[PDB]
Design a protein around this ligand. Structure first.
Ligand SMILES: Cn1nc(-c2ccc3ccccc3c2)c2c(N)ncnc21
Length: 843
C-alpha cells in the first residue's frame, strides 16, 4: 500500500538513514532483523497500559534520602494546586497517593475525572505511588522549591495510537584472492600482508598470515589459508577478522555463522575500514559504504548447518581468591583451568560468572556444549539480587556467546524505569558488542523504550546520535530506531518530527556563523548582525511554534527570544540560544537556554555526564549529596550538538578576568568576593559557601576517578548560589582543580587548616570510599566508555588507570590517606598548572 510508503519516508527523515537501502550489504541480516523485531514490538505495544503510558509518571521505589527527610521537618509536604489562576495550598503527608490528595482537595473546595500535572511541563503526578516517591517531588525538596501543580483532564490515550503495520570434521580455510585500493596512502613502497583471525569475544582462536608482498594499488596472493580449527568447532558468533599490516592499517570482519545458523559460503569483496593514525569499532560486521575510495579484500569460502565430589580446602581458597578479584585482573592459564574444572563450585558464586565464562574454550564444540549444560541449572543466578556491574561485564566485548549474554539481559528485566534511565546510554553503547543485529539486548531496549515515553525519548536521541556519526554501526542502530518509532505512537512521532526539524535548522546556522569569524579573539558587530537576521528568517516561516527540549523532554520551548541570542566568544563559535516557554501555566517568565556547538565530541560529554548521575546515585544510597550539576547534553551530529544553559552561572576564568585579566596572574580572593556580591543576605552567602564545599568535593572525587581532573579554569563554572561544576569534557600535572581561589572560599591559606576545609576533606573521604564500595561497576562503565566513546585505547594501560585511582586492594585507611595526599598535591602546586596554560601558548 501507498500510505505504508509515505510512513517509511517519514521514518527515514526521523532516523537520518534509509533502512530499506541494501547497497552496502553482503546478506539479508538487516531485513531479517526488521521483520524479527515486529513481534516483540507488537507485544509491548499491545500490553502497555494506555493511561499510564500517556502520562508517563516519573517515579522511584528507592527510599527518600536522609537529607530530603530533614527537609520535611513535620511529616507534611506542601502542594499548591491551580485551576485557572486560582490556587490553594493543601497540606499533605509523604505517603499520600495522588488519588488521596485529590479526595482532600475536592472536599476542601466543593461541599468527570482530572489529574495533577506539574506547572509548566508535560509531567504528571499519578498512579499508586506516594508523592514522596515521585521524581518531580524529590527535585523540589532538594532545591527548596514549592511543588506547583495544575488541574486538568488527562491527555487522550487516543493521541498515542499506533498505526497498524503491514509485513563436519575438516579444517576451516579461507582463500585470499587479493587486495585493491584505487589510490595508495602515504605513498612510499612498503610491504603488506593479510592477517586472518578467527575471533570469539575478542579471544583469538586461531591465526594465519599471507606472505609479505609489494604494497601496490593491487596485490594478489591466491592462497588457501588453513586454520587449526575444525568446522564443527566454530562457535556461533565467531568472526573472520581480516587485517592488513605494514603497522595495522585496514580491517574488516565477516560473521562465519549467520543469523540462520548457516556456515558462510562463497565469494566476498569486502570493503574495509582504515585505522586512524582495543575499541568497539574494530568489531563491526558492517563493511565500508564508500565503495569508491576504500581498500577492499577478496575472499573465497567453500567449506552448511548446525544449531559432584568435594573440592579440597586450599583449592577452594585459591578459587575464592580468583573470584574476589577485580574485573581487569588477567586470569592466568592455571586460573582458567581451575575455574573450568571446578565449574560447578564456581556456578554457586554469581560474581565468578565473568571469569568462569572467560575460562571457556569457545573454539571446542564439546566444551561449549558442557557450558550450555552448565547454564541450564541457573538457580543461584536467577535468585541472586541484581548487581548491575556484574551484569554489564557479561555484555562487554569479552563475551560473544548468545547464551551467556542473554542471562545478563534477563537480570536487567527487574530494573525499574528509574534505573534504566541511569544505564540507558551505556546499554545502547553495549549494542556495539553484539555479534548479531537482533539480540536480547536490542530487544530489551526496544521493549523498555516502548513501555515508557521518557526512556523512548532518550532511546531515540542516543540511537540517532550514533546513526548520524558512526559508519561502523549506523545500519544496526537504524534498524533498532525504526523498530522503536514504529511502536511509539502518533503523538510522539509528531513530537520527534518537530524536534528533528528544529535542530536541522539550528545546526545549519551554527556552521554558517563559524566561517564568518575564523579563530580571531573577538565577536564583531557584523557577526551579531547576521545571527539576528538568520533567526528572524527562521522563525517567521520555518521554525515550529513549539518543540520539546531533547535534553529535558518535559519542557516545551516556543519562540526565540532573539534579543538574548548571541554568538559566544570562544575559538569554536557556539550559538547561545534562548527560547520562551510554550506552556502558559509556567510559574516563571524565565527562558529555556540552549547552546549549539560544533568543535568537540559531545558523545564524550554524554558519557561522562551519565557516569556522573550514576555516581550521585551511589552517593544517594549512603545518604550523601555532593551537588553535582550534570547539565543536559545531546550529541546530534558530527562533532556537533546541544547543551543546556545553566542559569546564573559564569566561568571561574571569567570571574578571574573581571577586576583584572592580565597574563596568567590569578587572585585568591575574587571567587569569595564574587559570591558575596551575588548574595543579598549573609544567610544566602553562607548557604553559597556550604554548597561550594559540597560541589567542589563532588567534582574533585568524581573527576579524579575518571582521570579528567586536570582542567583549565575556562572549563570550570559556578552558579550564583555556590554550585561548582566542570564543563566541556569532550575538550606538571594536578589530580584535580583545587586552586587557591577555591581554598580561600574555604577559609584557608597556603598550608593551613580551617573549619570549611576540615569539612571539605571530610566529605571528599566519605565520597571517595563510597565509590570504592562500587568498584567493579565503575571499572566496567569506565572501560566501556573508553571502548565505545574514544579513539584507539589501551586494552591495558588506558583502562587500568581507574583501578589505581580507585586504589583497588587497599583497606579504608590507605585509601583515605591516598586521597588526602592528592588534596595536598593541589595545595603545593597552587596556581602552577593554570599559569602554565598561558605560559604554554607561547610554546
Ligand atoms: C559560559 N557557559 N559555557 C557553557 C558551556 C557549558 C558546557 C559545554 C559543554 C560542551 C561544550 C561547550 C559547553 C559550553 C555554559 C552552559 N552550559 N551554561 C551556562 N553557561 C555556560
Amino acid at each position: 500500500s501507498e500510505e505504508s510508503q509515505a510512513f517509511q519516508r517519514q521514518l527515514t527523515a526521523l532516523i537520518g538513514y534509509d533502512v530499506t537501502d541494501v547497497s552496502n550489504v553482503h546478506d539479508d541480516e538487516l531485513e531479517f532483523t526488521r521483520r524479527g523485531l515486529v513481534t516483540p514490538r507488537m507485544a509491548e505495544v499491545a500490553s502497555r497500559d494506555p493511561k499510564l503510558y500517556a502520562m508517563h509518571p516519573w517515579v522511584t521505589s528507592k527510599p527518600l534520602p536522609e537529607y530530603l527527610w530533614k527537609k520535611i521537618a513535620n511529616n507534611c509536604i506542601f502542594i499548591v494546586i491551580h485551576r485557572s489562576t486560582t490556587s490553594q495550598t493543601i497540606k499533605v503527608s509523604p505517603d499520600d497517593t495522588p488519588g488521596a490528595i485529590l479526595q482532600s482537595f475536592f472536599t476542601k473546595m466543593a461541599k468527570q475525572d482530572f489529574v495533577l500535572r506539574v506547572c509548566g511541563r508535560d509531567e504528571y503526578l499519578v498512579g499508586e505511588t506516594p508523592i514522596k516517591n515521585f521524581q518531580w517531588v524529590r527535585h523540589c525538596l532538594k532545591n527548596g522549591e514549592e511543588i506547583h501543580v495544575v488541574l486538568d483532564t488527562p491527555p487522550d490515550p487516543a493521541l498515542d495510537e499506533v498505526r497498524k503495520e503491514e509485513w563436519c570434521d575438516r579444517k576451516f580455510r579461507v582463500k585470499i584472492r587479493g587486495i585493491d585500493i584505487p589510490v595508495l596512502p602515504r605513498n612510499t613502497d612498503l610491504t603488506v600482508f593479510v592477517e586472518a583471525n578467527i575471533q570469539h569475544g575478542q579471544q583469538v582462536l586461531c591465526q594465519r598470515r599471507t606472505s609479505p608482498k609489494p604494497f601496490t594499488e593491487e596485490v594478489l596472493w591466491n592462497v588457501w589459508l588453513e586454520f587449526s580449527i575444525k568446522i564443527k568447532d566454530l562457535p556461533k558468533g565467531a568472526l573472520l577478522n581480516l587485517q592488513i599490516y605494514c603497522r595495522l592499517l585496514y580491517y574488516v570482519n565477516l560473521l562465519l555463522i549467520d543469523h540462520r545458523f548457516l556456515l558462510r559460503r562463497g565469494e566476498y569483496v569486502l570493503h574495509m575500514w582504515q585505522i586512524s593514525g582495543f575499541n568497539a569499532d574494530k568489531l563491526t560486521s558492517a563493511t565500508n559504504p564508500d565503495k569508491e575510495n576504500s581498500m577492499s579484500i577478496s575472499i573465497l569460502l567453500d567449506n552448511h548447518p548446525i544449531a559432584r565430589a568435594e573440592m579440597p580446602n586450599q583449592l577452594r581458597k585459591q578459587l575464592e581468591a580468583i573470584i574476589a578479584t577485580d574485573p581487569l585482573n588477567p586470569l592466568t592459564a592455571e586460573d582458567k583451568e581451575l575455574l573450568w574444572h571446578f565449574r560447578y563450585e564456581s556456578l554457586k558464586h554469581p560474581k565468578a560468572y565473568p571469569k568462569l565464562f572467560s575460562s571457556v574454550k569457545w573454539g571446542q564444540q564439546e566444551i561449549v556444549a558442557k557450558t550450555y549444560q552448565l547454564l541450564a541449572r541457573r538457580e543461584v543466578w536467577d535468585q541472586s539480587a541484581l548487581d548491575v556491574g556484574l551484569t554489564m561485564q557479561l555484555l562487554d566485548c569479552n563475551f560473544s556467546d548468545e547464551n551467556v549474554r542473554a542471562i545478563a539481559v534477563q537480570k536487567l528485566e527487574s530494573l525499574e524505569d528509574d534505573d534504566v534511565l541511569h544505564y540507558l546510554l551505556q546499554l545502547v553503547q553495549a549494542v556495539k558488542f553484539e555479534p548479531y543485529h537482533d539480540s536480547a539486548l536490542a530487544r530489551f531496549l526496544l521493549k523498555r523504550g516502548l513501555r515508557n515515553k521518557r526512556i523512548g525519548h532518550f532511546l531515540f536521541w542516543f540511537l540517532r546520535s550514533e546513526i548520524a556519526q558512526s559508519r561502523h554501526y549506523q545500519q544496526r542502530f537504524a534498524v533498532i530506531l525504526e523498530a522503536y518509532l514504529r511502536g511509539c505512537g502518533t503523538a510522539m512521532l509528531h513530537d520527534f518530527t518537530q524536534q528533528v526539524q528544529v535542530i536541522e535548522m539550528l545546526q545549519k546556522v551554527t556552521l554558517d556563523i563559524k566561517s564568518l569569524s575564523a579563530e580571531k579573539y573577538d565577536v564583531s558587530s557584523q557577526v551579531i548582525s547576521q545571527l539576528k537576521q538568520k533567526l528572524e528568517n527562521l522563525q517567521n516561516s520555518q521554525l515550529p511554534e513549539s518543540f520539546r527540549v531533547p535534553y529535558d523532554p518535559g519542557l516545551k520551548a516556543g519562540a526565540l527570544a532573539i534579543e538574548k541570542c548571541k554568538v559566544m566568544a570562544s575559538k569554536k563559535k557556539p550559538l547561545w540560544l534562548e527560547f520562551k516557554c510554550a506552556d502558559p501555566t509556567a510559574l516563571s517568565n524565565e527562558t529555556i537556554g540552549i547552546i549549539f556547538k560544533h568543535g568537540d565530541d559531545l558523545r564524550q560529554d554524554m558519557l561522562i555526564l551519565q557516569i556522573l548521575r550514576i555516581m550521585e546515585s551511589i552517593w544517594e544510597t549512603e545518604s550523601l549529596d555532593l551537588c553535582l550539576l550534570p547539565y543536559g547534553c545531546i550529541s546530534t551530529g558530527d562533532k556537533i550538538g546541544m547543551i543546556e544553559i545553566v542559569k546564573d552561572a559564569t566561568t571561574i576564568a571569567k570571574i578571574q578576568q573581571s577586576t583584572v585579566g592580565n597574563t596568567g596572574a590569578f587572585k585568591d580572593e575574587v571567587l569569595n568576593h564574587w559570591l558575596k556580591e551575588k548574595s543579598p543576605t549573609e544567610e544566602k552567602f553562607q548557604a553559597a559557601v556550604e554548597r561550594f564545599v559540597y560541589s567542589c568535593a563532588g567534582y574533585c572525587v568524581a573527576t579524579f576517578v575518571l582521570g579528567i581532573g586536570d582542567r583549565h579554569n575556562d572549563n570550570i563554572m559556578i552558579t550564583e548560589t555556590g554550585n561548582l561544576f566542570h564543563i566541556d569534557f569532550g575538550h606538571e600535572r594536578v589530580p584535580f582543580v583545587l586552586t587557591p581561589d577555591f581554598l580561600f572560599v574555604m577559609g584557608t591559606s597556603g598550608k593551613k587548616t580551617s573549619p570549611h576545609f576540615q569539612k571539605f576533606q571530610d566529605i571528599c573521604v566519605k565520597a571517595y570510599l563510597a565509590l570504592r564500595h562500587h568498584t567493579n561497576l565503575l571499572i566496567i562503565l569506565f572501560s566501556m566508555m573508553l571502548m565505545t566513546g574514544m579513539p584507539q585505547l589501551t586494552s591495558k594501560e588506558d583502562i587500568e588507570y581507574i583501578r589505581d585511582a580507585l586504589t583497588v586492594g587497599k583497606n579504608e585507611e590507605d585509601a583515605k590517606k591516598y586521597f588526602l595526599d592528592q588534596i595536598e598535591v593541589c595545595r603545593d602546586k597552587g596556581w602552577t598548572v593554570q599559569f602554565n596554560w598561558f605560559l604554554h601558548l607561547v610554546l
